[PDB]
Amino acid sequence: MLPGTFFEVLKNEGVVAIATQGEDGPHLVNVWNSYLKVLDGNRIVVPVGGMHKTEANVARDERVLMTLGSRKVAGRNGPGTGFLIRGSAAFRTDGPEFEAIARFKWARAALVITVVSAEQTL
Amino acid sequence: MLPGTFFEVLKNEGVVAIATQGEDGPHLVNVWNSYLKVLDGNRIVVPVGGMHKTEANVARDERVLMTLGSRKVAGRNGPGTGFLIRGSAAFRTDGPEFEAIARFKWARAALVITVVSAEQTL
Numbered sequence: 001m002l003p004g005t006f007f008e009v010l011k012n013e014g015v016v017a018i019a020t021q022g023e024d025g026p027h028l029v030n031v032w033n034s035y036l037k038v039l040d041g042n043r044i045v046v047p048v049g050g051m052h053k054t055e056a057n058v059a060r061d062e063r064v065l066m067t068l069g070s071r072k073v074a075g076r077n078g079p080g081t082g083f084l085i086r087g088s089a090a091f092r093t094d095g096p097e098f099e100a101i102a103r104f105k106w107a108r109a110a111l112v113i114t115v116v117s118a119e120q121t122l
Numbered sequence: 123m124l125p126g127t128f129f130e131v132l133k134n135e136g137v138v139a140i141a142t143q144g145e146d147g148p149h150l151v152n153v154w155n156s157y158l159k160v161l162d163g164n165r166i167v168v169p170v171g172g173m174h175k176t177e178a179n180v181a182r183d184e185r186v187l188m189t190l191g192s193r194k195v196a197g198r199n200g201p202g203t204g205f206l207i208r209g210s211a212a213f214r215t216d217g218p219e220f221e222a223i224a225r226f227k228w229a230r231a232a233l234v235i236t237v238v239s240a241e242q243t244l
């Protein structure tokens with residue numbers, strides 16, 4: 001589900017954005033490119049320190065959107081590219097998916113996104 | 123209301139994310155940090171090439187969220203910071219606000235976000 005170009009982006013630093021559906025409109029939070037841990041089976045795991053509004057939103061609608069990119073990775077028509085990722089989210093406080101990011105001692109949980117599509121948008 | 127630290131982020135490379143309310147959940151698109159033009163009156167202007175889905179969403183609900191950041195600007199507790207911006211959006215296709223993105227020959231419109239709040243989230 002995730003292409004090589006996406007993994008090239010992860011080698012470079014940047015701001016990842018994660019959108020959820022809130023009660024009165026969207027919500028949007030961030031993690032660093034370098035924090036994403038990709039597992040077998042199309043899973044992206046990120047360390048959760050805060051994300052309290054985000055978790056409440058996911059509890060009611062598991063569908064999330066994620067974007068990320070880098071000026072340092074070539075797109076289709078010039079330098080720089082990025083991705084829109086769609087997937088279903090779940091929060092874990094134990095298990096192997098949590099342990100994948102437990103090295104971040106500030107992490108109260110892991111946000112696990114199982115990817116349903118990845119589009120290179122540049 | 124945009125703080126100095128926000129303008130420092132704009133001096134650095136990054137991916138900006140813009141969330142809108144869609145009919146069946148959020149939508150999320152990107153521009154580059156360096157593309158943003160800030161005008162007086164709390165206005166952030168970005169070049170529109172695609173964003174047809176985003177524009178349709180704005181037509182139904184003008185409220186948007188924006189995040190951006192940089193590892194190269196110090197946050198409150200270490201290197202790296204970023205912002206959550208909330209504001210109202212409009213799409214201009216003539217006039218001063220459109221002229222503000224004139225350097226982008228590929229642009230079909232200017233997305234003008236009038237900022238209601240800016241929160242440094244790291």
Ligand SMILES: Cc1cc2nc3c(=O)[nH]c(=O)nc-3n(C[C@H](O)[C@H](O)[C@H](O)COP(=O)(O)O)c2cc1C
Binds near residue numbers: 031051054205243
């Ligand atoms: C560049 C950047 C990186 C961030 N990385 C994380 C992160 O790895 N984990 C986290 O929980 N919050 C991170 N945050 C903070 C979140 O964006 C968000 O503000 C916070 O978790 C509160 O989430 P909520 O609004 O859903 O309650 C980061 C913020 C920025 C600007």
Ligand SMILES: Cc1cc2nc3c(=O)[nH]c(=O)nc-3n(C[C@H](O)[C@H](O)[C@H](O)COP(=O)(O)O)c2cc1C
Binds near residue numbers: 137157
């Ligand atoms: C790093 C990056 C920068 C982008 N910059 C722009 C931009 O300046 N203007 C634009 O219209 N689309 C830009 N895009 C594409 C948008 O994110 C989006 O995919 C496209 O405009 C279609 O919008 P829509 O899904 O709302 O129709 C960029 C994408 C990436 C990954």
